[PDB]
C-alpha cells in the first residue's frame, strides 16, 4: 500500500509512493539510477536500486560499505544520503535496497570540453577540493576521481558523486601498485584541471602499459628518488623503459589555450607531479592563489557469511 512498482527497462522499481515519475539517468555496476520527484520534499532526487547486494561476498561487502560511509559523511560538495528503504518486510524476504540521494544536473564530462573562464574554472576546483578534504578527514581516500563521478548543477555548484576505490586520471602510485597518501587525489584534480584547459584527456592511455608511457612521455622520467621506492618486479620494468625527457608546463599548457593563466599553470605543475612527496597537498592547494579567492572556513574545514552481511545491511536500512 505504501509502495508501488514501475518498470525501468528490464528492472522493476518498487518504491515508496512519495517518489514519482522515475526516469533512468544512468547505470553503474552498483546498480540502476533514476531521477524521481519526491512529493514530500518537493524536489527531484536520485534513486539507486542496489544490484544484487547479497549475490556474493564482494557485493555484500560493497553494499555495506556504501551504506555506512554515506551515513557518516555530510558536506555540501559530496552527494548526500536522503533516505534508504526496502520493500521487503523481514530479514527472511529481504532482497532489495534503495538509496535515495541528491540529484544534480550533469556530470563534468559535458562541461569540461566547453570553454570555461577562470572564475568558473577556479570555483569548481575549489568545491572539488572542499569535497576531497572532507572525505579525507573522514579517512576516505578516493583514488578514482574522474569527470564522470563529479557532478554539477546549473547554478555552478559541484558535488563529488561517490567514495572511490576499495584509467586516465589515476595517480602513478596507484597504477604502479605503490603505497599512496591523501595527495594521490591531487593528481586526479590536476588531470581534470589539465583537461579543462587543453580541451582533452592529458594521458589517454590505451592500456595500463601505454598509460605510464604517456605520463612519463609528457612529464619526464621520475628521478632516482622514486624508482628506489619501487617494488623489484615493477622497479625493473619502469627502469628498463626508454628514458623520456620532460617538456615544460609552458610547453604542455601554453598561453594559446587560456582565456591568472600563469597561475593555473603553476598549480598544475604542483599537482601533476609523479613523485607524490613533491606533489602539493589539499590544504596547500586550497590556499593557493588560483583557488584561495573563494575561501570560506565553514566549507573548507572483517569477514562475514552472506547471511551475516545480509543481517548487517538490513540493520543499516532499518
Amino acid at each position: 500500500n505504501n509502495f508501488y512498482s514501475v518498470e525501468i527497462g528490464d528492472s522493476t522499481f518498487t518504491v515508496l509512493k512519495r517518489y514519482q515519475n522515475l526516469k533512468p539517468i544512468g547505470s553503474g555496476a552498483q546498480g540502476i539510477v533514476c531521477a524521481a520527484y519526491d512529493a514530500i520534499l518537493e524536489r527531484n532526487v536520485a534513486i539507486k536500486k542496489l544490484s544484487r547486494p547479497f549475490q556474493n561476498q564482494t557485493h555484500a561487502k560493497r553494499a555495506y560499505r556504501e551504506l555506512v560511509l554515506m551515513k557518516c559523511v555530510n558536506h555540501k560538495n559530496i552527494i548526500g544520503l536522503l533516505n534508504v528503504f526496502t520493500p521487503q518486510k523481514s530479514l527472511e524476504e529481504f532482497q532489495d535496497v534503495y538509496i535515495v540521494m541528491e540529484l544534480m544536473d550533469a556530470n563534468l564530462c559535458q562541461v569540461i570540453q566547453m570553454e570555461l573562464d577562470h572564475e568558473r574554472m577556479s570555483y569548481l576546483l575549489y568545491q572539488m577540493l572542499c569535497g576531497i578534504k572532507h572525505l579525507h578527514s573522514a579517512g576516505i581516500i578516493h583514488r578514482d576521481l574522474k569527470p564522470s563521478n563529479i557532478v554539477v548543477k546549473s547554478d555552478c555548484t559541484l558535488k563529488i558523486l561517490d567514495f572511490g576505490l576499495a584509467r586516465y586520471y589515476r595517480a602513478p602510485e596507484v597504477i604502479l601498485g605503490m603505497g599512496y597518501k591523501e595527495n594521490v587525489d591531487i593528481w586526479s584534480v590536476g588531470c581534470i584541471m589539465g583537461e579543462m584547459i587543453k580541451g582533452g584527456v592529458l594521458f589517454p592511455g590505451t592500456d595500463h602499459i601505454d598509460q605510464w608511457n604517456k605520463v612519463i612521455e609528457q612529464l619526464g622520467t621520475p628521478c632516482p628518488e622514486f624508482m628506489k621506492k619501487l617494488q623489484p618486479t615493477v622497479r625493473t620494468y619502469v627502469e628498463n623503459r626508454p628514458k623520456y625527457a620532460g617538456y615544460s608546463f609552458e610547453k604542455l599548457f601554453p598561453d594559446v589555450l587560456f582565456p591568472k593563466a600563469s597561475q593555473a599553470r603553476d598549480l598544475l605543475s604542483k599537482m601533476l607531479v609523479i613523485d607524490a612527496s613533491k606533489r602539493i597537498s589539499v590544504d596547500e592547494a586550497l590556499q593557493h592563489p588560483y583557488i584561495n579567492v573563494w575561501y570560506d572556513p565553514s566549507e573548507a574545514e572483517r569477514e562475514h557469511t552472506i547471511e551475516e552481511w545480509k543481517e548487517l545491511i538490513y540493520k543499516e536500512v532499518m
Binding site: 562541461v111 570555483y123 554539477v152 546549473s154 547554478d155 555552478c156 573563494w294
Partner: peptide, 9 residues
Amino acid sequence: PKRPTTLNL
C-alpha cells in the same frame, strides 16, 4: 568575490 551563480550545460 561574488562566486559564479550560473554554469552553461
